[PDB]
Amino acid sequence: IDLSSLRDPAGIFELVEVGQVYKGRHVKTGQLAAIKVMDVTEDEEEEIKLEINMLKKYSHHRNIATYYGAFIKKSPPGHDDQLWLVMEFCGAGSITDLVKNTKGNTLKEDWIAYISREILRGLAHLHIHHVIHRDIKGQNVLLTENAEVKLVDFGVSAQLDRTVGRRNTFIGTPYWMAPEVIACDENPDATYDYRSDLWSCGITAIEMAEGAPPLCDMHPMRALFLIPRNPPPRLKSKKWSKKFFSFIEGCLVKNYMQRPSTEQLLKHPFIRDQPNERQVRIQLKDHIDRTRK
Amino acid sequence: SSLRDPAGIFELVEVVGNGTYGQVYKGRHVKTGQLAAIKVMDVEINMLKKYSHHRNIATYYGAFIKKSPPGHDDQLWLVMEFCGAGSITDLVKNTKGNTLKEDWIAYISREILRGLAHLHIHHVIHRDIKGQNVLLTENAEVKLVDFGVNTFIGTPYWMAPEVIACDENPDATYDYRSDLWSCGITAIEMAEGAPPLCDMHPMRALFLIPRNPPPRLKSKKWSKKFFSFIEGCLVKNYMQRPSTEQLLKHPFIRDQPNERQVRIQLKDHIDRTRK
Ligand SMILES: Nc1ncnc2ccc(-c3cc(F)cc(NC(=O)CN4CCCC4)c3)cc12
Ligand SMILES: [Mg+2]
């Protein structure tokens, strides 16, 4: 295993069934793995090498779907090669899937507290190693069959899955984007900071509570204009606890300079005080099981 | 509700063209072997139905629903004419020097504009004109794809200034003339191999388009008519931008003496690129 290299995947990883996300396996162990396969030009291969040097290293962590490495499956000369980004497998789907299947498209507050803490613990690990995730959203928060919460990592340190295959030219979905990452009249140069992940975490908590991020009903281009202008988003319903409202307001501080860090939000009462944690963990494991059958 | 299953009628071959369009496949009509493009969506049809009957718009064939087990999300299939010779972005990328001959640009730009004129006369704005949505057939016919147009913002480089919301323009005013700005950027893309601001971060380009003066061709080699055409498409304030009809009369578009040879040169280029 090497994360500073760019070898052919043959004899290391192979694809089993469905850049597109594929189910794959480590040849020698038989361990399942999610593999992102992208078409790369023979010129984009030189861009990968530079981005691989930009990679920051960090250990395994229980809240991060481990990034195993990058590989290039070479095609005949002239023909577009294949970039493979290999990551640990999470079989119970995303948090967006979880909230979508449930009745009323809303999760119980103690489920949001549990999932949000796992997201933050994963983020704390990335931030302490000087890495910004940059794409926190319910789709990138996965569940294992054992109700373990893991952040998608296809080489987040150098954003290997967002910089090649003409993907780099796409703006993407704007709804989880922090105000500072949106270039507007007062912010001409986008400023990605570790705290941009915390804004995304707050939008993910709203998404778990309501089934969709704020401004979901708007055209992405309109939402992109409104995020840096609108006051921080709020939960629509008054049903929620005072701690949950407080948590949202904590993440969603408009000016990133004044937004708390991961450690400070990990101490927030909504995250810190989870009396029914054991039952939540059981309720989630049970929800995953009955959804499978 | 009367949409049938595609089995035995259309089959998916492969993704076209490796993520750039999303879930769009090169399909095949089972009984004839005739190729088709199929837009597969997880489940705006009559838009592609009556507005695609024009030689410069890829023709709509039909709609199908591939039924999944109860509870599991079904698949809508939208089938249209396949354009086998790739996009004009592919064309310029696959040309030596990443630039097309001016008479090729004149020809392709006229076909884009004729497709746009058809859409605009029916009160339809394409909204996503770019080299990647302008396709070639094997016999060098030019066809527009992806009109209508939901949560993903694509590439910003071909977007007109008025379509980008800012302090003075809070509500992005999509107008038929926004497609003409996109056609001018497509002509620059054919001339240089990339749109203006290509070297910038898409988010930075989105900030600069409504602020920057109209883009210009970098080289002085081009004819005065071609410079005039670019200036016509790229008028900053859409209120003074010409209509599709006015640009169709522009000398660069209207006066094409070597049209027959261009068509032959394009057919020949498509063939050499295939092998
Ligand atoms: N006719 C053809 N022949 C050959 N290659 C073709 C390649 C692409 C297409 C095509 C057809 C179509 F309906 C829509 C789109 N584009 C998108 O779906 C983009 N969406 C914007 C919002 C979500 C994604 C592309 C037709 C082809
Ligand atoms: Mg047609």
Ligand catalogue: ligand 2QT, magnesium ion
Which fold does the CATH topology of the largest domain in chain A refer to?
Transferase(Phosphotransferase), domain 1
Strand content of chain A: 5-15%
Oligomer state equals homodimer
PDB class: transferase/transferase inhibitor
Keywords: kinase, transferase-transferase inhibitor complex
Assembly: dimeric
Entry title: MAP4K4 in complex with inhibitor (compound 31), N-[3-(4-AMINOQUINAZOLIN-6-YL)-5-FLUOROPHENYL]-2-(PYRROLIDIN-1-YL)ACETAMIDE
Write a structural description.
2 copies of one chain form a homodimer. The first copy, chain A, is α+β, with helices and mostly antiparallel strands. Chain A folds into 2 domains: 1-89, Phosphorylase Kinase, domain 1, CATH 3.30.200.20; 90-293, Orthogonal Bundle (Transferase(Phosphotransferase), domain 1), CATH 1.10.510.10. Chain A has 9 helices and 7 strands. Chain A has helices spanning 44-53, 95-101, 109-128, 196-210, 220-226, 242-251, 262-266, 269-272, 277-292; strands at 13-17, 21-26, 32-40, 67-73, 81-88, 141-143, 149-151. A 5-stranded antiparallel sheet of chain A has the order 1-2-3-5-4, with no helix packed on it. A two-stranded antiparallel ribbon of chain A has the order 6-7. In chain A, a hairpin with a 7-residue loop joins strand 4 (67-73) and strand 5. The two termini of chain A are 36 Å apart. Residues 16, 21-22, 24, 37, 39, 58, 78, 80-83, 135, 145-146, 149, 152 of chain B line the site of the ligand Nc1ncnc2ccc(-c3cc(F)cc(NC(=O)CN4CCCC4)c3)cc12.
